[PDB]
């Protein structure tokens, strides 16, 4: 399966040229594949404020999860690891409100950042109901009670 995925991603990246040098597919966690892409044209796949990265991460999920049964971790250069480090600050600030109060909330981050945040908050906080609720302004928040 890992072979078919990589064969299709290399396939695709030369039916429409990007300067793409690495496309690795590997097992990352139980049921999760790491898709790792780099090159000179890496920032062209990240896009204005990571919109293309987000598009790609959904599109890779919608292909790989229905066909191969795996969820996805996408990395383009060091984009995701930077986003995870940035998110880590606010996310420890939340965990310390939920331990000094018991109640907390942080605005849902962009794309799969929300789902990474969910697992991390769900891990500090058994036993507490970490879920994603939406407000009257249609703004999504991860809420802990």
């Amino acid at each position: 399966k890992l072979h078919e995925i990589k064969q299709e991603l290399k396939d695709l990246f030369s039916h429409l040229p990007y300067k793409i040098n690495k496309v690795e597919v590997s097992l990352y966690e139980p049921g999760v594949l790491l898709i790792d892409i780099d090159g000179e044209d890496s920032a062209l796949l990240i896009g204005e404020k990571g919109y293309r990265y987000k598009a790609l991460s959904y599109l890779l999920f919608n292909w790989i999860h229905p066909t191969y049964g795996y969820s996805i971790r996408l990395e383009i250069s060091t984009f995701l690891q930077n986003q995870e480090k940035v998110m880590d600050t606010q996310l420890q600030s939340v965990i310390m409100t939920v331990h000094e109060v018991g109640k907390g909330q942080m605005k849902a981050p962009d794309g799969v950042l929300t789902y990474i945040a969910l697992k991390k908050l769900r891990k500090a906080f058994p036993n507490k109901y970490v879920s994603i609720k939406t407000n009257l302004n249609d703004e999504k928040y991860i809420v802990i009670n």
Binding site: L12, L16, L45, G47, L59, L60, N62, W63, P66, T67
Partner: protein, 323 residues
Amino acid sequence: LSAEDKKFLEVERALKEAALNPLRHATEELFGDFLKMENITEICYNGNKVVWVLKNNGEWQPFDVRDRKAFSLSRLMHFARCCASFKKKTIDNYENPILSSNLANGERVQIVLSPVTVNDETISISIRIPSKTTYPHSFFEEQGFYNLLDNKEQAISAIKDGIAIGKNVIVCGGTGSGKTTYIKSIMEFIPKEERIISIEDTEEIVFKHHKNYTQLFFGGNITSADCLKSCLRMRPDRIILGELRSSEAYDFYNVLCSGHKGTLTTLHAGSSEEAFIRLANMSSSNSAARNIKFESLIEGFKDLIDMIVHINHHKQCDEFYIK
């Protein structure tokens, strides 16, 4: 920068096509010959090597498939799993033996497995084919659609004049009554200057007389009610709601209450009274309506629905309800 966005669109399309390919291939392998048939409404497989096709004229036609490798159990289970995974569902012989899903071009699929079916070698599949061909309203007048009504020409005037002035109209009947084909024909009588917004799950409604329009579609995590909420922020003159099925019927009730006239919709019902009951029952499953008396729900629709056209099983109107 436009050239980079234009290029990335092609990456998106290639990745979308990649996702749909296993479903598109499994579909063609089993039902390709039948999906290519002209004038079809439904394709059914009953778990015994016969594919049943229902034509537009109401005739069921059987086809033997005992010779075809595609109708093996494992190939039918493969197809079912592709269908399931496409709408982020599962199908199995245990807790999920019933599936409602879609094919790539949006046609509805119903799949049933053992132990809900008779035995482990029985797989049930039902594919509904969307209403494609667009008929002018003249076709309905010429082919005897109104012939059962003892006030023929008065009823035709009422529908034309009611649609024109912005009355709330519902067209009901059973499956294959031609509800949608009929809604489309009467769109002729909406003034051409009106901004229409339609809400469907697949593209059926056609715009032949109107230039200012937007089509909205629900599916996945987008609900009909999400589209209706958006619709109200898009300055429509006319709202066409393809079909009422469940809780969005009460969202539709609130639209009627919001001072919006000129709504057009369909539902499954056997008469006008059954339409009101059906409306109230569908509304009941909604948040705002959980503590509302059924009788109040019914009277609320009766104060707001102007016309109901019911179509029998022979594609004729047998009831023209006017308020």
